[PDB]
Amino acid sequence: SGAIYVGNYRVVNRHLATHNDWANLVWEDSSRDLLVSSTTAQGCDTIARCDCQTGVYYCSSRRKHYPVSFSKPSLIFVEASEYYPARYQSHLMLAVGHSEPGDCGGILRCQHGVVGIVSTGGNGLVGFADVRDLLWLDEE
Ligand SMILES: Cn1ccnc1-c1noc(C2CCC2)n1
Ligand SMILES: [Zn+2]
């Protein structure tokens, strides 16, 4: 679990969205595993606007932050997970590192702020849902 809190937006894994997130829906995309909902209190997070391929992500299943190199956001085939089938996911960035299903929502951050959240795992890779293309998170 985990979320990005930017302005009055809450960014979560679409597969972990609550009834409240769906009841207060701003934007969702099953092919990115991303859902954004509206918040009452404003958020502490800034969004990276950058093409950085180095950063640090939180791994809840290790209680650790790991510096990683990661691929640019792409359309990637992902093997079946306990929360999704074997399928293509878009705007996905891969690095070498530990990602279990409960790691989804852990933040990946660079020198420019929040890059994305853990979305995929297994075979010693960790996939992140990029949010740096979502410029609209930075206003309204
Ligand atoms: C409707 N739509 C479709 C694709 N992207 C959007 C979207 N992005 O931001 C928003 C507005 C910004 C304030 C909430 N909608
Ligand atoms: Zn950056």
XYZ file of N, CA and C and ligand atoms in Angstrom:
436
model
N 0.847 -1.220 0.000
C 0.000 0.000 0.000
C 0.874 1.259 0.000
N 0.243 2.392 -0.299
C 0.853 3.726 -0.294
C 0.176 4.608 -1.317
N 0.372 5.909 -1.206
C -0.256 6.905 -2.106
C 0.668 8.099 -2.285
N 0.498 8.824 -3.393
C 1.066 10.188 -3.576
C -0.021 11.183 -3.181
N 0.362 12.173 -2.374
C -0.516 13.286 -1.923
C 0.059 14.613 -2.446
N -0.422 15.028 -3.617
C 0.017 16.244 -4.362
C -1.220 17.122 -4.545
N -1.128 18.394 -4.144
C -2.269 19.326 -4.086
C -3.432 18.699 -3.334
N -4.602 18.631 -3.965
C -5.808 17.965 -3.408
C -6.072 16.704 -4.232
N -4.995 16.015 -4.623
C -5.049 14.732 -5.365
C -4.396 13.646 -4.523
N -4.962 12.452 -4.611
C -4.404 11.239 -3.979
C -4.150 10.232 -5.098
N -2.887 9.878 -5.336
C -2.480 8.925 -6.419
C -2.200 7.560 -5.778
N -3.001 6.562 -6.144
C -2.893 5.161 -5.652
C -2.865 4.225 -6.862
N -2.453 2.980 -6.609
C -2.583 1.820 -7.527
C -4.073 1.645 -7.783
N -4.514 1.670 -9.044
C -5.937 1.473 -9.409
C -6.451 0.232 -8.685
N -5.650 -0.835 -8.636
C -6.080 -2.125 -8.041
C -6.238 -1.965 -6.524
N -5.640 -0.944 -5.891
C -5.811 -0.727 -4.427
C -6.780 0.426 -4.113
N -7.396 1.055 -5.116
C -8.328 2.185 -4.904
C -9.459 1.731 -3.973
N -9.905 2.619 -3.084
C -11.015 2.341 -2.136
C -12.342 2.779 -2.764
N -13.452 2.375 -2.146
C -14.796 2.900 -2.496
C -14.728 4.430 -2.463
N -14.038 5.006 -1.472
C -13.949 6.481 -1.321
C -13.203 7.072 -2.529
N -12.087 6.460 -2.970
C -11.348 6.928 -4.182
C -12.274 6.897 -5.406
N -13.016 5.807 -5.608
C -13.975 5.674 -6.742
C -15.115 6.698 -6.595
N -15.610 6.926 -5.369
C -16.669 7.915 -5.050
C -16.188 9.354 -5.297
N -14.868 9.592 -5.291
C -14.254 10.939 -5.451
C -13.229 10.876 -6.578
N -13.572 10.167 -7.655
C -12.680 9.889 -8.816
C -12.396 11.164 -9.624
N -11.120 11.356 -9.974
C -10.609 12.424 -10.872
C -10.218 11.793 -12.215
N -9.461 10.696 -12.199
C -8.870 10.059 -13.403
C -8.424 8.634 -13.054
N -8.690 7.672 -13.938
C -8.158 6.293 -13.794
C -7.771 5.730 -15.171
N -6.868 4.746 -15.155
C -6.288 4.072 -16.346
C -5.816 2.677 -15.925
N -6.583 1.642 -16.272
C -6.265 0.233 -15.915
C -4.934 -0.196 -16.548
N -4.576 0.373 -17.706
C -3.348 0.021 -18.465
C -2.121 0.670 -17.820
N -2.307 1.594 -16.873
C -1.193 2.183 -16.075
C -1.256 1.752 -14.603
N -2.279 0.983 -14.229
C -2.614 0.655 -12.820
C -2.668 1.944 -11.982
N -3.127 3.080 -12.545
C -3.198 4.368 -11.788
C -4.654 4.828 -11.595
N -4.959 5.319 -10.394
C -6.222 6.031 -10.094
C -5.918 7.263 -9.245
N -6.535 8.386 -9.603
C -6.416 9.641 -8.819
C -7.812 10.034 -8.336
N -7.904 10.350 -7.047
C -9.122 10.821 -6.346
C -8.853 12.187 -5.691
N -9.927 12.911 -5.378
C -9.883 14.258 -4.756
C -9.741 14.108 -3.238
N -9.046 15.045 -2.589
C -8.786 15.062 -1.123
C -9.316 16.374 -0.528
N -9.567 16.393 0.779
C -10.004 17.619 1.491
C -8.739 18.397 1.882
N -7.863 17.808 2.706
C -6.554 18.385 3.107
C -5.561 18.283 1.938
N -4.749 19.330 1.725
C -3.681 19.381 0.681
C -2.521 18.461 1.090
N -1.671 18.070 0.128
C -0.649 17.012 0.289
C 0.782 17.541 0.302
N 1.708 16.761 0.893
C 3.131 17.116 1.176
C 4.071 16.777 0.005
N 3.575 16.119 -1.056
C 4.419 15.509 -2.122
C 4.514 16.480 -3.302
N 5.698 16.574 -3.909
C 6.000 17.280 -5.178
C 6.274 16.217 -6.242
N 5.853 16.452 -7.488
C 6.003 15.473 -8.598
C 7.255 15.855 -9.386
N 8.171 14.907 -9.587
C 9.312 15.013 -10.526
C 8.779 15.327 -11.923
N 9.339 16.355 -12.557
C 9.201 16.626 -14.008
C 10.605 16.516 -14.592
N 10.921 15.361 -15.182
C 12.320 14.980 -15.500
C 12.373 13.681 -16.304
N 13.518 13.394 -16.929
C 13.816 12.063 -17.522
C 14.962 11.403 -16.740
N 14.962 11.530 -15.410
C 15.907 10.801 -14.515
C 15.686 9.305 -14.637
N 16.772 8.539 -14.653
C 16.716 7.054 -14.578
C 17.431 6.574 -13.317
N 17.655 7.453 -12.339
C 18.197 7.045 -11.014
C 17.392 7.719 -9.904
N 17.153 6.984 -8.841
C 16.292 7.434 -7.748
C 16.331 6.445 -6.614
N 15.376 6.557 -5.713
C 15.266 5.718 -4.496
C 13.793 5.373 -4.354
N 13.477 4.115 -4.053
C 12.088 3.659 -3.811
C 12.012 2.975 -2.451
N 10.837 3.044 -1.838
C 10.539 2.356 -0.565
C 9.962 0.967 -0.819
N 10.582 -0.028 -0.195
C 10.166 -1.440 -0.233
C 9.616 -1.814 1.143
N 8.290 -1.856 1.268
C 7.591 -2.121 2.547
C 7.968 -3.535 3.013
N 8.110 -4.485 2.082
C 8.407 -5.912 2.385
C 9.873 -6.107 2.814
N 10.645 -5.008 2.926
C 12.017 -4.983 3.503
C 12.174 -3.868 4.532
N 11.199 -2.956 4.626
C 11.236 -1.719 5.452
C 12.429 -0.838 5.056
N 12.818 -0.831 3.788
C 14.090 -0.201 3.348
C 13.834 0.680 2.129
N 14.643 1.721 1.982
C 14.704 2.527 0.732
C 15.932 2.059 -0.040
N 15.795 1.795 -1.340
C 16.887 1.250 -2.178
C 17.154 2.212 -3.320
N 18.411 2.660 -3.509
C 18.770 3.455 -4.677
C 18.684 2.466 -5.839
N 18.150 2.916 -6.968
C 17.957 2.070 -8.180
C 18.186 2.930 -9.417
N 18.672 2.290 -10.471
C 18.546 2.736 -11.876
C 17.282 2.108 -12.444
N 16.496 2.809 -13.268
C 15.216 2.274 -13.788
C 15.061 2.684 -15.245
N 14.287 1.904 -16.002
C 14.116 2.119 -17.456
C 13.178 3.316 -17.659
N 13.141 3.916 -18.847
C 12.146 4.985 -19.105
C 10.761 4.350 -19.228
N 9.685 5.130 -18.951
C 8.315 4.613 -18.995
C 8.014 4.019 -20.376
N 7.508 2.780 -20.424
C 7.275 2.006 -21.674
C 6.057 1.087 -21.525
N 5.657 0.440 -22.628
C 4.607 -0.604 -22.650
C 5.297 -1.959 -22.499
N 4.985 -2.684 -21.424
C 5.793 -3.830 -20.918
C 4.853 -4.985 -20.599
N 5.205 -6.194 -21.016
C 4.447 -7.413 -20.652
C 4.802 -7.757 -19.208
N 3.780 -7.993 -18.385
C 3.925 -8.294 -16.934
C 3.282 -9.657 -16.674
N 4.011 -10.574 -16.041
C 3.509 -11.922 -15.671
C 2.427 -11.786 -14.597
N 1.560 -12.797 -14.488
C 0.381 -12.804 -13.596
C 0.838 -12.538 -12.162
N 0.138 -11.639 -11.474
C 0.339 -11.321 -10.038
C -0.968 -11.601 -9.294
N -0.922 -11.663 -7.962
C -2.101 -12.023 -7.131
C -3.236 -11.007 -7.345
N -2.952 -9.815 -7.893
C -3.918 -8.693 -8.082
C -4.164 -8.384 -9.570
N -3.484 -9.061 -10.503
C -3.660 -8.859 -11.970
C -3.240 -10.104 -12.742
N -3.772 -10.295 -13.971
C -3.316 -11.368 -14.849
C -1.990 -10.997 -15.524
N -1.346 -11.968 -16.177
C -0.294 -11.723 -17.185
C -0.892 -10.832 -18.287
N -0.336 -9.636 -18.480
C -0.895 -8.598 -19.387
C 0.189 -7.562 -19.678
N -0.074 -6.689 -20.652
C 0.721 -5.470 -20.919
C 0.241 -4.358 -19.984
N 1.197 -3.632 -19.406
C 0.965 -2.392 -18.625
C 1.790 -1.296 -19.296
N 1.225 -0.097 -19.443
C 1.858 1.071 -20.103
C 2.532 1.964 -19.056
N 3.342 2.918 -19.520
C 4.067 3.926 -18.704
C 4.752 3.239 -17.512
N 5.264 2.027 -17.711
C 5.930 1.239 -16.650
C 7.453 1.405 -16.779
N 8.119 1.612 -15.636
C 9.593 1.715 -15.489
C 10.052 0.536 -14.647
N 11.077 -0.196 -15.104
C 11.612 -1.396 -14.410
C 13.008 -1.083 -13.860
N 13.294 -1.593 -12.677
C 14.642 -1.632 -12.073
C 14.836 -3.018 -11.446
N 16.069 -3.319 -11.035
C 16.462 -4.568 -10.318
C 16.278 -4.293 -8.833
N 15.509 -5.147 -8.171
C 15.124 -4.929 -6.776
C 13.894 -5.726 -6.435
N 13.590 -5.734 -5.143
C 12.547 -6.577 -4.534
C 11.235 -5.796 -4.504
N 10.206 -6.428 -5.066
C 8.807 -5.948 -5.187
C 7.879 -7.157 -5.016
N 7.233 -7.252 -3.851
C 6.088 -8.150 -3.560
C 4.792 -7.363 -3.717
N 3.644 -8.045 -3.936
C 2.375 -7.350 -4.164
C 2.036 -6.244 -3.147
N 2.405 -6.437 -1.881
C 2.138 -5.486 -0.788
C 3.071 -4.286 -0.816
N 4.045 -4.285 -1.739
C 5.016 -3.176 -1.944
C 4.393 -2.110 -2.848
N 3.306 -2.444 -3.548
C 2.608 -1.519 -4.474
C 2.215 -0.266 -3.687
N 2.496 0.929 -4.232
C 2.222 2.242 -3.614
C 3.459 2.866 -2.976
N 4.515 2.084 -2.757
C 5.807 2.617 -2.293
C 6.295 3.622 -3.313
N 6.837 4.746 -2.849
C 7.249 5.885 -3.735
C 8.633 5.625 -4.321
N 8.792 6.034 -5.578
C 10.095 6.162 -6.240
C 10.309 7.661 -6.444
N 11.443 8.159 -5.977
C 11.774 9.600 -5.977
C 13.204 9.784 -6.466
N 13.404 10.903 -7.152
C 14.707 11.370 -7.657
C 14.954 12.745 -7.044
N 15.978 13.447 -7.535
C 16.329 14.822 -7.096
C 15.203 15.825 -7.418
N 14.202 15.477 -8.232
C 13.126 16.414 -8.675
C 11.805 16.145 -7.929
N 11.765 15.154 -7.030
C 10.551 14.784 -6.273
C 10.083 13.369 -6.591
N 8.764 13.146 -6.579
C 8.119 11.810 -6.725
C 8.077 11.438 -8.214
N 8.614 10.267 -8.544
C 8.666 9.759 -9.942
C 7.449 8.852 -10.185
N 7.024 8.074 -9.202
C 5.975 7.080 -9.458
C 5.824 6.158 -8.269
N 5.052 5.096 -8.417
C 4.780 4.207 -7.260
C 5.001 2.778 -7.709
N 5.370 1.897 -6.768
C 5.583 0.460 -7.069
C 4.260 -0.046 -7.642
N 4.320 -0.746 -8.762
C 3.113 -1.348 -9.397
C 3.294 -2.850 -9.691
N 4.501 -3.314 -10.028
C 4.746 -4.735 -10.405
C 5.946 -5.280 -9.630
N 6.105 -6.600 -9.635
C 7.224 -7.287 -8.962
C 7.443 -8.691 -9.501
N 8.389 -9.414 -8.907
C 8.704 -10.811 -9.263
C 9.888 -10.898 -10.211
N 10.578 -12.043 -10.201
C 11.808 -12.313 -10.993
C 12.859 -11.232 -10.714
N 12.883 -10.684 -9.494
C 13.916 -9.737 -9.024
C 13.852 -8.368 -9.688
N 12.778 -8.060 -10.424
C 12.484 -6.691 -10.923
C 11.417 -6.042 -10.026
N 11.364 -4.710 -10.082
C 10.317 -3.852 -9.465
C 9.868 -2.888 -10.559
N 8.571 -2.904 -10.858
C 7.974 -1.995 -11.840
C 7.317 -0.839 -11.130
N 7.511 0.369 -11.661
C 6.934 1.634 -11.147
C 6.016 2.232 -12.203
N 4.816 2.641 -11.783
C 3.870 3.445 -12.588
C 4.357 4.892 -12.572
N 4.907 5.332 -13.690
C 5.356 6.727 -13.884
C 4.137 7.649 -13.745
N 4.327 8.800 -13.094
C 3.296 9.863 -12.963
C 3.885 11.194 -13.433
N 5.121 11.216 -13.952
C 5.825 12.470 -14.334
C 5.190 13.056 -15.611
N 4.493 12.255 -16.420
C 3.812 12.777 -17.635
C 2.503 13.475 -17.238
N 1.991 13.247 -16.021
C 0.684 13.789 -15.547
C 0.891 15.213 -15.019
N 1.028 16.193 -15.921
C 1.372 17.600 -15.566
C 0.219 18.219 -14.760
N -1.017 17.790 -15.035
C -2.254 18.330 -14.413
C -2.261 18.097 -12.900
N -1.472 17.156 -12.372
C -1.328 16.974 -10.900
C -0.779 18.258 -10.259
N -0.124 19.135 -11.036
C 0.618 20.333 -10.541
C -0.263 21.592 -10.506
N -1.593 21.458 -10.577
C -2.547 22.606 -10.607
C -3.993 22.112 -10.462
N -4.927 23.027 -10.179
C -6.391 22.752 -10.145
C -6.652 21.545 -9.231
C -10.281 14.197 -17.841
N -8.954 13.707 -18.183
C -8.699 12.752 -19.133
C -7.356 12.631 -19.196
N -6.754 13.471 -18.301
C -7.746 14.078 -17.676
C -7.565 14.917 -16.504
N -6.378 15.170 -16.053
O -6.617 16.110 -15.048
C -7.936 16.316 -15.033
C -8.422 17.485 -14.276
C -7.260 18.320 -13.754
C -8.108 18.761 -12.676
C -8.747 17.441 -12.797
N -8.571 15.569 -15.867
Zn 14.325 13.678 -11.525
